[PDB]
Amino acid sequence: ALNVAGLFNNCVDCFEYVQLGRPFGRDYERCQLRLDIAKARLSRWGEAVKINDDPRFHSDAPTDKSVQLAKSIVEEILLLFESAQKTSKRYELVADQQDLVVFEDKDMKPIGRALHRRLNDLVSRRQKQTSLAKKTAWALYDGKSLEKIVDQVARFVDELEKAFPIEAVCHKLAEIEIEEVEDEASLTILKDAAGGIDAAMSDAAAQKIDAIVG
Amino acid sequence: ALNVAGLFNNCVDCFEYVQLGRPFGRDYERCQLRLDIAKARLSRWGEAVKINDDPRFHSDAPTDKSVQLAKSIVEEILLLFESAQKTSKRYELVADQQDLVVFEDKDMKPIGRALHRRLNDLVSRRQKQTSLAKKTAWALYDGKSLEKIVDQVARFVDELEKAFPIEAVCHKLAEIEIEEVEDEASLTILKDAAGGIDAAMSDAAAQKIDAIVG
Protein backbone atom coordinates (compact mmCIF):
# COMPACT_ATOMS: atom_id res chain seq x y z
CA ALA A 1 0.00 0.00 0.00
CA LEU A 2 2.31 2.89 1.41
CA ASN A 3 6.08 2.86 1.37
CA VAL A 4 8.12 1.48 4.31
CA ALA A 5 8.61 4.88 5.99
CA GLY A 6 4.79 5.37 5.96
CA LEU A 7 4.25 1.93 7.48
CA PHE A 8 6.86 2.61 10.14
CA ASN A 9 5.34 5.96 11.09
CA ASN A 10 1.92 4.38 11.41
CA CYS A 11 3.45 1.73 13.66
CA VAL A 12 4.83 4.32 16.01
CA ASP A 13 1.47 6.14 15.89
CA CYS A 14 -0.41 3.00 17.02
CA PHE A 15 0.93 3.25 20.60
CA GLU A 16 -0.74 6.68 20.69
CA TYR A 17 -4.19 5.07 20.76
CA VAL A 18 -3.71 2.31 23.33
CA GLN A 19 -5.38 2.77 26.70
CA LEU A 20 -5.13 0.65 29.80
CA GLY A 21 -8.43 -0.40 31.34
CA ARG A 22 -9.49 -0.73 35.03
CA PRO A 23 -8.19 -4.30 35.68
CA PHE A 24 -4.55 -3.09 35.51
CA GLY A 25 -5.07 -1.65 38.96
CA ARG A 26 -1.85 -0.56 40.65
CA ASP A 27 0.13 -1.98 37.72
CA TYR A 28 -1.12 0.86 35.48
CA GLU A 29 1.85 3.24 35.90
CA ARG A 30 4.54 0.59 35.30
CA CYS A 31 2.69 -0.97 32.38
CA GLN A 32 2.27 2.36 30.67
CA LEU A 33 6.02 3.01 31.12
CA ARG A 34 6.75 -0.35 29.47
CA LEU A 35 4.57 0.52 26.47
CA ASP A 36 6.30 3.93 26.34
CA ILE A 37 9.75 2.27 26.37
CA ALA A 38 8.84 -0.22 23.66
CA LYS A 39 7.46 2.79 21.70
CA ALA A 40 10.77 4.62 22.33
CA ARG A 41 12.86 1.72 21.19
CA LEU A 42 10.98 1.43 17.90
CA SER A 43 11.27 5.15 17.10
CA ARG A 44 14.94 5.10 18.10
CA TRP A 45 15.48 2.49 15.41
CA GLY A 46 13.84 4.64 12.81
CA GLU A 47 16.10 7.49 13.71
CA ALA A 48 19.25 5.44 13.75
CA VAL A 49 18.32 4.24 10.23
CA LYS A 50 17.24 7.74 9.06
CA ILE A 51 13.85 6.33 7.98
CA ASN A 52 12.55 9.65 6.65
CA ASP A 53 15.66 10.61 4.62
CA ASP A 54 17.12 7.37 3.22
CA PRO A 55 15.26 6.97 -0.14
CA ARG A 56 15.44 3.16 0.11
CA PHE A 57 12.49 3.29 2.52
CA HIS A 58 10.52 5.49 0.11
CA SER A 59 9.32 2.94 -2.44
CA ASP A 60 6.40 0.48 -2.36
CA ALA A 61 8.34 -2.61 -3.47
CA PRO A 62 12.00 -2.13 -2.46
CA THR A 63 14.68 -4.38 -4.06
CA ASP A 64 17.07 -4.36 -1.13
CA LYS A 65 16.88 -7.38 1.21
CA SER A 66 17.19 -5.42 4.43
CA VAL A 67 14.49 -2.95 3.50
CA GLN A 68 12.22 -5.89 2.66
CA LEU A 69 12.71 -7.46 6.12
CA ALA A 70 11.92 -4.16 7.79
CA LYS A 71 8.89 -3.82 5.58
CA SER A 72 7.83 -7.36 6.61
CA ILE A 73 8.55 -6.72 10.37
CA VAL A 74 6.66 -3.43 10.36
CA GLU A 75 3.63 -5.05 8.68
CA GLU A 76 3.80 -7.59 11.49
CA ILE A 77 3.82 -5.04 14.34
CA LEU A 78 0.63 -3.59 12.76
CA LEU A 79 -0.96 -7.07 12.83
CA LEU A 80 -0.09 -7.25 16.53
CA PHE A 81 -2.10 -4.10 17.11
CA GLU A 82 -4.83 -5.46 14.94
CA SER A 83 -5.08 -8.72 16.93
CA ALA A 84 -4.91 -7.00 20.24
CA GLN A 85 -7.67 -4.54 19.18
CA LYS A 86 -9.94 -7.48 18.35
CA THR A 87 -9.24 -9.34 21.57
CA SER A 88 -10.12 -6.16 23.41
CA LYS A 89 -13.31 -5.40 21.41
CA ARG A 90 -14.47 -8.77 22.60
CA TYR A 91 -13.67 -8.45 26.29
CA GLU A 92 -15.89 -5.33 26.03
CA LEU A 93 -18.73 -7.44 24.60
CA VAL A 94 -18.71 -9.48 27.83
CA ALA A 95 -17.46 -7.06 30.43
CA ASP A 96 -18.93 -5.45 33.45
CA GLN A 97 -19.28 -1.74 32.46
CA GLN A 98 -17.10 -0.81 35.51
CA ASP A 99 -14.02 -2.33 33.97
CA LEU A 100 -14.48 -0.15 30.90
CA VAL A 101 -13.06 2.95 32.57
CA VAL A 102 -9.52 3.58 31.30
CA PHE A 103 -6.65 5.12 33.28
CA GLU A 104 -4.89 8.41 32.38
CA ASP A 105 -1.48 9.73 33.39
CA LYS A 106 -3.22 11.82 36.10
CA ASP A 107 -3.48 8.44 37.81
CA MET A 108 0.28 8.02 38.04
CA LYS A 109 2.50 9.36 40.77
CA PRO A 110 4.27 12.66 39.77
CA ILE A 111 7.57 10.90 38.99
CA GLY A 112 6.00 8.38 36.61
CA ARG A 113 3.92 10.99 34.82
CA ALA A 114 7.01 13.18 34.15
CA LEU A 115 8.70 10.09 32.66
CA HIS A 116 5.67 9.14 30.51
CA ARG A 117 5.51 12.67 29.12
CA ARG A 118 9.25 12.85 28.67
CA LEU A 119 9.34 9.55 26.81
CA ASN A 120 6.43 10.66 24.63
CA ASP A 121 8.18 14.00 23.77
CA LEU A 122 11.33 12.30 22.67
CA VAL A 123 9.24 10.27 20.25
CA SER A 124 7.03 13.22 19.08
CA ARG A 125 10.21 15.10 18.26
CA ARG A 126 11.15 12.23 15.89
CA GLN A 127 7.69 11.86 14.31
CA LYS A 128 7.73 13.77 11.02
CA GLN A 129 4.44 12.95 9.36
CA THR A 130 1.20 14.79 9.56
CA SER A 131 -0.03 12.25 6.92
CA LEU A 132 -0.65 9.36 9.34
CA ALA A 133 -3.72 7.14 8.75
CA LYS A 134 -6.77 7.62 10.95
CA LYS A 135 -7.09 5.39 14.08
CA THR A 136 -9.45 5.11 17.03
CA ALA A 137 -8.62 4.60 20.72
CA TRP A 138 -9.00 1.12 22.22
CA ALA A 139 -8.18 -0.47 25.57
CA LEU A 140 -6.07 -3.38 26.88
CA TYR A 141 -7.71 -5.22 29.76
CA ASP A 142 -5.11 -7.67 31.10
CA GLY A 143 -1.40 -7.99 31.93
CA LYS A 144 -0.94 -10.77 29.43
CA SER A 145 -2.06 -8.91 26.35
CA LEU A 146 0.25 -6.02 27.19
CA GLU A 147 3.18 -8.35 27.80
CA LYS A 148 2.61 -9.90 24.35
CA ILE A 149 2.74 -6.49 22.68
CA VAL A 150 5.70 -5.26 24.76
CA ASP A 151 7.71 -8.48 24.41
CA GLN A 152 6.97 -8.95 20.72
CA VAL A 153 7.71 -5.37 19.82
CA ALA A 154 11.05 -5.81 21.61
CA ARG A 155 11.92 -9.02 19.61
CA PHE A 156 10.84 -7.32 16.39
CA VAL A 157 13.07 -4.34 17.02
CA ASP A 158 15.86 -6.79 17.92
CA GLU A 159 15.55 -8.09 14.42
CA LEU A 160 15.27 -4.64 12.78
CA GLU A 161 18.59 -3.83 14.42
CA LYS A 162 20.13 -7.17 13.23
CA ALA A 163 19.17 -6.23 9.68
CA PHE A 164 21.27 -3.06 9.89
CA PRO A 165 24.70 -2.04 11.29
CA ILE A 166 23.58 0.48 13.92
CA GLU A 167 23.88 -1.16 17.29
CA ALA A 168 26.65 1.43 18.06
CA VAL A 169 24.38 4.27 16.87
CA CYS A 170 21.49 2.85 18.92
CA HIS A 171 23.61 2.85 22.05
CA LYS A 172 24.53 6.49 21.53
CA LEU A 173 20.87 7.38 20.80
CA ALA A 174 19.91 5.68 24.05
CA GLU A 175 22.33 7.80 26.06
CA ILE A 176 21.06 10.91 24.41
CA GLU A 177 17.43 10.04 25.35
CA ILE A 178 18.60 10.11 28.92
CA GLU A 179 21.20 12.92 29.18
CA GLU A 180 18.67 15.30 30.76
CA VAL A 181 17.20 13.01 33.41
CA GLU A 182 19.27 13.70 36.41
CA ASP A 183 17.63 12.22 39.53
CA GLU A 184 18.51 8.64 40.51
CA ALA A 185 14.91 7.87 41.48
CA SER A 186 13.91 8.49 37.85
CA LEU A 187 16.94 6.70 36.35
CA THR A 188 16.14 3.70 38.60
CA ILE A 189 12.59 3.49 37.36
CA LEU A 190 13.84 3.48 33.72
CA LYS A 191 16.56 0.94 34.37
CA ASP A 192 13.98 -1.41 35.82
CA ALA A 193 11.15 -0.82 33.32
CA ALA A 194 13.50 -1.15 30.30
CA GLY A 195 14.39 -4.57 31.68
CA GLY A 196 14.04 -7.37 29.17
CA ILE A 197 12.87 -4.89 26.50
CA ASP A 198 15.55 -2.25 25.98
CA ALA A 199 19.01 -3.40 27.03
CA ALA A 200 20.36 -0.18 25.44
CA MET A 201 18.19 2.17 27.62
CA SER A 202 18.91 0.05 30.63
CA ASP A 203 22.76 0.06 30.36
CA ALA A 204 22.56 3.84 29.82
CA ALA A 205 20.43 4.31 32.92
CA ALA A 206 22.75 1.93 34.81
CA GLN A 207 25.85 3.86 33.58
CA LYS A 208 24.25 7.19 34.67
CA ILE A 209 23.28 5.99 38.24
CA ASP A 210 26.89 4.87 38.95
CA ALA A 211 28.25 8.14 37.60
CA ILE A 212 26.37 10.14 40.30
CA VAL A 213 27.28 7.56 43.02
CA GLY A 214 31.04 8.66 42.92
CA ALA B 1 -16.41 -7.86 4.27
CA LEU B 2 -18.09 -11.43 4.00
CA ASN B 3 -20.52 -12.87 6.50
CA VAL B 4 -19.34 -15.01 9.45
CA ALA B 5 -19.88 -18.35 7.67
CA GLY B 6 -17.66 -17.11 4.79
CA LEU B 7 -14.95 -16.03 7.22
CA PHE B 8 -15.13 -19.37 9.01
CA ASN B 9 -14.86 -21.36 5.78
CA ASN B 10 -11.83 -19.34 4.73
CA CYS B 11 -10.28 -20.06 8.12
CA VAL B 12 -10.64 -23.78 7.64
CA ASP B 13 -9.28 -23.40 4.09
CA CYS B 14 -6.10 -21.70 5.35
CA PHE B 15 -4.69 -24.96 6.79
CA GLU B 16 -4.92 -26.30 3.23
CA TYR B 17 -2.04 -24.07 2.13
CA VAL B 18 0.45 -24.56 4.97
CA GLN B 19 3.56 -26.59 4.24
CA LEU B 20 6.28 -27.72 6.57
CA GLY B 21 9.82 -26.94 5.47
CA ARG B 22 13.06 -29.00 5.77
CA PRO B 23 14.07 -27.95 9.34
CA PHE B 24 11.16 -29.96 10.83
CA GLY B 25 13.19 -33.06 10.16
CA ARG B 26 11.82 -36.17 11.84
CA ASP B 27 9.19 -34.03 13.58
CA TYR B 28 7.38 -33.53 10.23
CA GLU B 29 4.82 -36.36 10.56
CA ARG B 30 3.76 -35.48 14.13
CA CYS B 31 3.63 -31.76 13.43
CA GLN B 32 1.45 -32.24 10.40
CA LEU B 33 -0.90 -34.43 12.49
CA ARG B 34 -1.14 -31.62 15.06
CA LEU B 35 -2.07 -29.08 12.38
CA ASP B 36 -4.61 -31.61 11.03
CA ILE B 37 -6.13 -32.05 14.51
CA ALA B 38 -6.36 -28.32 15.15
CA LYS B 39 -7.96 -28.06 11.66
CA ALA B 40 -10.38 -30.86 12.65
CA ARG B 41 -11.32 -29.22 15.90
CA LEU B 42 -12.17 -25.94 14.18
CA SER B 43 -14.36 -27.59 11.52
CA ARG B 44 -16.02 -29.74 14.19
CA TRP B 45 -17.12 -26.52 15.87
CA GLY B 46 -18.63 -25.21 12.70
CA GLU B 47 -20.61 -28.37 12.32
CA ALA B 48 -21.78 -28.49 15.88
CA VAL B 49 -23.04 -24.90 15.41
CA LYS B 50 -24.50 -25.60 11.93
CA ILE B 51 -22.49 -22.69 10.49
CA ASN B 52 -23.85 -23.10 6.95
CA ASP B 53 -27.55 -23.41 7.89
CA ASP B 54 -28.13 -21.13 10.92
CA PRO B 55 -29.01 -17.74 9.28
CA ARG B 56 -27.45 -15.84 12.20
CA PHE B 57 -24.02 -16.48 10.66
CA HIS B 58 -25.23 -15.21 7.27
CA SER B 59 -25.14 -11.45 7.80
CA ASP B 60 -22.24 -8.95 7.66
CA ALA B 61 -23.00 -7.17 10.94
CA PRO B 62 -24.86 -9.62 13.22
CA THR B 63 -26.73 -8.24 16.28
CA ASP B 64 -26.34 -11.32 18.46
CA LYS B 65 -23.48 -11.21 20.99
CA SER B 66 -22.33 -14.77 20.44
CA VAL B 67 -22.19 -14.43 16.69
CA GLN B 68 -20.13 -11.26 17.14
CA LEU B 69 -17.54 -13.06 19.31
CA ALA B 70 -17.24 -15.83 16.75
CA LYS B 71 -16.90 -13.23 14.05
CA SER B 72 -14.14 -11.54 16.12
CA ILE B 73 -12.37 -14.91 16.90
CA VAL B 74 -12.48 -16.02 13.28
CA GLU B 75 -11.00 -12.70 12.11
CA GLU B 76 -8.25 -13.36 14.64
CA ILE B 77 -7.39 -16.87 13.39
CA LEU B 78 -6.97 -15.29 9.91
CA LEU B 79 -4.53 -12.74 11.39
CA LEU B 80 -2.58 -15.65 12.86
CA PHE B 81 -2.15 -17.06 9.38
CA GLU B 82 -1.30 -13.64 8.11
CA SER B 83 1.45 -13.13 10.71
CA ALA B 84 2.86 -16.57 10.26
CA GLN B 85 2.94 -16.11 6.45
CA LYS B 86 5.01 -12.94 6.90
CA THR B 87 7.42 -14.49 9.38
CA SER B 88 7.94 -17.27 6.88
CA LYS B 89 8.36 -15.00 3.81
CA ARG B 90 11.22 -13.49 5.72
CA TYR B 91 13.02 -16.65 6.78
CA GLU B 92 13.03 -17.36 3.01
CA LEU B 93 14.74 -14.00 2.36
CA VAL B 94 17.66 -15.19 4.51
CA ALA B 95 17.62 -18.93 4.13
CA ASP B 96 19.92 -21.45 2.62
CA GLN B 97 18.02 -22.70 -0.49
CA GLN B 98 18.27 -26.29 0.90
CA ASP B 99 15.89 -25.53 3.71
CA LEU B 100 13.30 -24.37 1.20
CA VAL B 101 12.27 -27.90 0.25
CA VAL B 102 8.92 -28.74 1.87
CA PHE B 103 7.78 -32.18 3.06
CA GLU B 104 4.76 -34.09 1.65
CA ASP B 105 2.73 -36.92 3.16
CA LYS B 106 4.81 -39.37 1.06
CA ASP B 107 7.43 -38.58 3.69
CA MET B 108 5.35 -40.00 6.52
CA LYS B 109 5.20 -43.61 7.58
CA PRO B 110 2.11 -45.46 6.16
CA ILE B 111 0.18 -45.20 9.44
CA GLY B 112 0.61 -41.43 9.74
CA ARG B 113 -0.28 -40.79 6.11
CA ALA B 114 -3.56 -42.78 6.43
CA LEU B 115 -4.39 -40.61 9.47
CA HIS B 116 -3.51 -37.32 7.71
CA ARG B 117 -5.71 -38.26 4.77
CA ARG B 118 -8.48 -39.51 7.01
CA LEU B 119 -8.46 -36.34 9.08
CA ASN B 120 -8.47 -34.24 5.90
CA ASP B 121 -11.48 -36.21 4.47
CA LEU B 122 -13.54 -35.69 7.55
CA VAL B 123 -13.01 -31.96 7.13
CA SER B 124 -13.53 -31.92 3.31
CA ARG B 125 -16.84 -33.65 3.87
CA ARG B 126 -17.88 -30.68 6.08
CA GLN B 127 -16.56 -27.97 3.73
CA LYS B 128 -19.52 -26.68 1.70
CA GLN B 129 -18.18 -23.72 -0.22
CA THR B 130 -16.71 -23.63 -3.64
CA SER B 131 -16.66 -19.80 -3.17
CA LEU B 132 -13.52 -19.66 -0.99
CA ALA B 133 -11.07 -16.76 -1.54
CA LYS B 134 -7.87 -17.42 -3.44
CA LYS B 135 -4.72 -18.28 -1.40
CA THR B 136 -1.15 -19.33 -2.14
CA ALA B 137 0.96 -22.03 -0.46
CA TRP B 138 3.56 -20.98 2.11
CA ALA B 139 5.88 -22.83 4.49
CA LEU B 140 6.55 -22.96 8.25
CA TYR B 141 10.22 -23.35 9.10
CA ASP B 142 10.42 -23.95 12.86
CA GLY B 143 8.72 -25.84 15.71
CA LYS B 144 7.88 -22.63 17.51
CA SER B 145 5.82 -21.02 14.79
CA LEU B 146 3.75 -24.18 14.40
CA GLU B 147 3.21 -24.46 18.14
CA LYS B 148 1.91 -20.86 18.17
CA ILE B 149 -0.62 -21.64 15.46
CA VAL B 150 -1.63 -25.01 16.94
CA ASP B 151 -1.87 -23.72 20.53
CA GLN B 152 -3.66 -20.50 19.62
CA VAL B 153 -6.13 -22.17 17.33
CA ALA B 154 -6.91 -24.53 20.22
CA ARG B 155 -7.51 -21.62 22.70
CA PHE B 156 -9.63 -19.82 20.09
CA VAL B 157 -11.82 -22.85 19.55
CA ASP B 158 -12.03 -23.21 23.34
CA GLU B 159 -13.63 -19.83 23.36
CA LEU B 160 -15.90 -20.49 20.34
CA GLU B 161 -17.26 -23.44 22.29
CA LYS B 162 -17.70 -21.30 25.46
CA ALA B 163 -19.81 -18.89 23.42
CA PHE B 164 -22.27 -21.67 22.56
CA PRO B 165 -23.93 -24.61 24.38
CA ILE B 166 -22.48 -27.50 22.36
CA GLU B 167 -19.80 -29.13 24.44
CA ALA B 168 -22.09 -32.24 24.56
CA VAL B 169 -22.54 -32.10 20.76
CA CYS B 170 -18.78 -31.63 20.31
CA HIS B 171 -18.06 -34.73 22.35
CA LYS B 172 -20.43 -36.79 20.22
CA LEU B 173 -18.93 -35.32 17.01
CA ALA B 174 -15.50 -36.32 18.28
CA GLU B 175 -16.56 -39.93 18.75
CA ILE B 176 -18.07 -40.00 15.33
CA GLU B 177 -14.78 -38.76 13.75
CA ILE B 178 -13.20 -41.84 15.21
CA GLU B 179 -15.80 -44.64 14.96
CA GLU B 180 -14.08 -46.14 11.89
CA VAL B 181 -10.49 -46.17 13.13
CA GLU B 182 -10.10 -49.55 14.61
CA ASP B 183 -6.41 -50.31 15.24
CA GLU B 184 -4.91 -49.34 18.61
CA ALA B 185 -1.67 -48.18 17.00
CA SER B 186 -3.67 -45.51 15.14
CA LEU B 187 -5.89 -44.61 18.12
CA THR B 188 -2.71 -44.22 20.22
CA ILE B 189 -1.17 -41.80 17.77
CA LEU B 190 -4.37 -39.66 17.85
CA LYS B 191 -4.67 -39.76 21.62
CA ASP B 192 -1.14 -38.46 21.92
CA ALA B 193 -1.22 -35.87 19.10
CA ALA B 194 -4.59 -34.43 20.27
CA GLY B 195 -2.89 -33.84 23.61
CA GLY B 196 -3.22 -30.29 24.88
CA ILE B 197 -5.21 -29.31 21.77
CA ASP B 198 -8.31 -31.50 21.53
CA ALA B 199 -9.37 -32.96 24.85
CA ALA B 200 -12.56 -34.18 23.09
CA MET B 201 -10.66 -36.23 20.42
CA SER B 202 -8.30 -37.49 23.04
CA ASP B 203 -10.93 -38.82 25.52
CA ALA B 204 -12.66 -40.49 22.54
CA ALA B 205 -9.44 -42.15 21.44
CA ALA B 206 -8.74 -43.09 25.08
CA GLN B 207 -12.29 -44.52 25.48
CA LYS B 208 -11.86 -46.57 22.24
CA ILE B 209 -8.42 -48.08 23.20
CA ASP B 210 -9.80 -49.38 26.54
CA ALA B 211 -12.86 -50.80 24.80
CA ILE B 212 -10.67 -53.14 22.67
CA VAL B 213 -8.43 -54.01 25.70
CA GLY B 214 -11.33 -56.03 27.36
Side-chain angles (χ1 to χ4, degrees), chain A residues 111-129:
Chain A
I111 204 190
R113 157 202 313 120
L115 236 19
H116 169 67
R117 287 170 189 212
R118 166 173 245 118
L119 255 9
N120 291 159
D121 289 348
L122 225 99
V123 356
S124 302
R125 157 183 273 282
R126 284 164 183 155
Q127 280 314 265
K128 215 179 184 204
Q129 264 190 63

Side-chain angles (χ1 to χ4, degrees), chain A residues 47-59 61-140:
Chain A
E47 170 112 314
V49 106
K50 296 150 191 213
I51 185 98
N52 301 130
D53 311 300
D54 180 342
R56 269 144 94 243
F57 303 111
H58 284 69
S59 47
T63 359
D64 189 85
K65 249 168 218 299
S66 278
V67 177
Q68 264 168 262
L69 273 91
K71 140 107 165 187
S72 193
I73 294 157
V74 160
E75 278 163 359
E76 218 168 308
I77 299 155
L78 265 357
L79 256 14
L80 217 62
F81 288 107
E82 248 202 288
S83 294
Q85 240 141 355
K86 264 173 219 284
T87 292
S88 136
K89 282 136 55 174
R90 98 186 160 259
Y91 171 97
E92 297 189 351
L93 248 48
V94 150
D96 176 74
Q97 140 277 309
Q98 280 175 121
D99 307 290
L100 283 154
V101 166
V102 312
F103 290 105
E104 311 285 341
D105 79 355
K106 66 198 186 50
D107 302 317
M108 306 186 173
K109 275 137 27 198
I111 204 190
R113 157 202 313 120
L115 236 19
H116 169 67
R117 287 170 189 212
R118 166 173 245 118
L119 255 9
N120 291 159
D121 289 348
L122 225 99
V123 356
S124 302
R125 157 183 273 282
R126 284 164 183 155
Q127 280 314 265
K128 215 179 184 204
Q129 264 190 63
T130 70
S131 49
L132 303 152
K134 219 232 197 149
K135 298 157 198 89
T136 82
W138 59 280
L140 291 157

Side-chain angles (χ1 to χ4, degrees), chain A residues 65 68-69 72-73 75-76 79-80 82-84 86-90 92-94 148 152 156 159, chain B residues 65 68-69 72-73 75-76 79-80 82-84 86-90 92-94 148 152 156 159:
Chain A
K65 249 168 218 299
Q68 264 168 262
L69 273 91
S72 193
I73 294 157
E75 278 163 359
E76 218 168 308
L79 256 14
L80 217 62
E82 248 202 288
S83 294
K86 264 173 219 284
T87 292
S88 136
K89 282 136 55 174
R90 98 186 160 259
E92 297 189 351
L93 248 48
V94 150
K148 197 134 130 201
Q152 289 208 223
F156 283 142
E159 83 180 284
Chain B
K65 249 168 218 299
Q68 264 168 262
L69 273 91
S72 193
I73 294 157
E75 278 163 359
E76 218 168 308
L79 256 14
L80 217 62
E82 248 202 288
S83 294
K86 264 173 219 284
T87 292
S88 136
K89 282 136 55 174
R90 98 186 160 259
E92 297 189 351
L93 248 48
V94 150
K148 197 134 130 201
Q152 289 208 223
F156 283 142
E159 83 180 284

Side-chain angles (χ1 to χ4, degrees), chain B residues 55-59 61-114:
Chain B
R56 269 144 94 243
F57 303 111
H58 284 69
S59 47
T63 359
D64 189 85
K65 249 168 218 299
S66 278
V67 177
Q68 264 168 262
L69 273 91
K71 140 107 165 187
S72 193
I73 294 157
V74 160
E75 278 163 359
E76 218 168 308
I77 299 155
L78 265 357
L79 256 14
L80 217 62
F81 288 107
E82 248 202 288
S83 294
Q85 240 141 355
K86 264 173 219 284
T87 292
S88 136
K89 282 136 55 174
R90 98 186 160 259
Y91 171 97
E92 297 189 351
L93 248 48
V94 150
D96 176 74
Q97 140 277 309
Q98 280 175 121
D99 307 290
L100 283 154
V101 166
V102 312
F103 290 105
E104 311 285 341
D105 79 355
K106 66 198 186 50
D107 302 317
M108 306 186 173
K109 275 137 27 198
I111 204 190
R113 157 202 313 120

